[PDB]
Amino acid sequence: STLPDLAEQFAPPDVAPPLLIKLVKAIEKKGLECSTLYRTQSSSNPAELRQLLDCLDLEMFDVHVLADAFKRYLLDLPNPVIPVAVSSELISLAPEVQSSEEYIQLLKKLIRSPSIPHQYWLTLQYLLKHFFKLSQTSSKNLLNARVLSELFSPLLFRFPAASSENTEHLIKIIEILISTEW
Amino acid sequence: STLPDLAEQFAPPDVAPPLLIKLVKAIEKKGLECSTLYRTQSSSNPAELRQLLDCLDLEMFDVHVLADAFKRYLLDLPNPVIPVAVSSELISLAPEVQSSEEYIQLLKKLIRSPSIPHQYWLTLQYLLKHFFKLSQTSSKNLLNARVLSELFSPLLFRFENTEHLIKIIEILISTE
């Protein structure tokens, strides 16, 4: 649990944590068309994956190890990419305020709060771009935006919560944000 | 004001915001012996000072304008160098605590909290180093740790109930 806060790992004008960029670039180089990328576990345990998140070129590793280390990274951030402040608010929204557009508007307003370092929103945007690029070779890797949201929303929000029509709505906006990256 | 959070202006391994470093270096080059540094209002208004903080060599500017822009910078940070949570805790202990060394140990403990980006403490240390350097020519600029603490504690904490905070800064300047 020695991964520094996102706000300490980089600062503007950099667009993302340098370790995260290395992971994403290696994964895209070696696994863009992999039909089980992020949907199978590798043999490495969390301690070994954490050991990798310190030291070599990440392209030297097995792609399934890199993919697991990507998840491990999202899980080990001291605060999640989408801070609990933001998700606590989004979950509290009523059924009458049910437009995905409104949920997205609120997520951007809350995460861009000056009470939240810009690094959180920057990292989320970088991850969305990766997820969008993956979904554009769906014909080969079988990943659409919705499945990528179902796989990664629990790692982005890190929020235990019964399956509400609120939680469906958070998966839905991530789904929309992946698809609408350009 | 569009000044970004301390945590957005730099990240480890850099030791301080690059704009703050530029200000400090220019002020120390041109004003180390100035008997009125940081105690005189210059002719510029906050908008003009912000224009200078929003961007070329800062040495071209009048030193009193640099000193004003340094204060403007500290005032315009979206969150103060010493976060409000930290200062609120130190203030609420005020009648029950009074060991100064305890206040200092606590200030450091609170500002190094994992919930607070390391940039806040890094920036505070950079500021303390500058304040200490000034105090080493106090015979000429008249800025000793106590005067520096009275001038800048209100900008660092962003605030009677406060005298123990001023003393913390005074001691932290002296022991650099």
Numbering used by the authors:
A (entry chain A): 113 to 167, 172 to 298
B (entry chain B): 113 to 167, 172 to 275, 281 to 297
Pull text from the paper:
The N-terminal domains of p85α include an SH3 domain, capable of binding to proline-rich sequences, and a BH (breakpoint cluster region homology) domain. The BH domain can bind to and regulate several GTPases including Rab5, Rac1 and Cdc42. In addition, the p85α BH domain, either alone or together with the SH3 domain, can bind to and positively regulate PTEN activity. The p85α BH domain also exhibits Rab5 GAP activity to stimulate Rab5-mediated GTP hydrolysis required to inactivate Rab5-mediated protein trafficking functions.
